[PDB]
Amino acid sequence: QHYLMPLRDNFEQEGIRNFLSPGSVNMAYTEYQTFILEKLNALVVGTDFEQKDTKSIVLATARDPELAHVFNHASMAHNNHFFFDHLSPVPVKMGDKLFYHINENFGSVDTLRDEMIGTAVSMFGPGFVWLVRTQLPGQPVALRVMATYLAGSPYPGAHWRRQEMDAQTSIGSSPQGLSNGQRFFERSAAGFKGNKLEPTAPGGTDLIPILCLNTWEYAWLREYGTGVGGMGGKLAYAQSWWNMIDWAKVEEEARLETRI
């Protein structure tokens, strides 16, 4: 059975000093991850996934509709803990190599700062904001930002459940509406028939999620409050989170090719 594991740097007992109080982290991870895992266990209590890791379940249990509900819990548990394994008790100084490459893809550290934060509030829904490292056979390593609705896997092997666009407000009668509509059907028709829209390298190495940001309500609704009056709120939650990013660990997962 899947069981809850400790956090990175004893955040369960102490929590981040200036980002999330210990009580908030308790309700955000210990009292939520346990709930998700409890449900997940009951689902895979007697299937092949009884001993598979979360990621393996995510990728494996993606295309199949009959197991959609299993993907949610497995993916949510993964993304949730993926979001806590990138914070740090004290702010870390951005690495030089990483600092340079960021400016080459986003123009500045602040340009990307306001993009991820802006994307969060723009969504107006629970989701995860990622930082993905794109790479193609001949194209150099290029970074980009991705938004995943509810439980969305940023990996290319889980393209079926990427959930990058809310079909409610993104498909209308306007010129953009029709364009978004075609893509929506093009993906469904392709996936259903088994055709591949965008070629991906074997092993799912094209995209590597480096950093994540959990925008779900339970995470920030307690410490920062409803946000009425702009004091605190979801906006402040994203801002404060930007100060605890463990840029050192972020650089490691980036695995940028030496080009300096």
Partner: peptide, 11 residues
């Protein structure tokens, strides 16, 4: 899942 752009395989 389809409300947010989620497509599946053959049922």
């Amino acid at each position: 899942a389809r409300m947010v752009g989620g497509y599946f395989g053959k049922d």
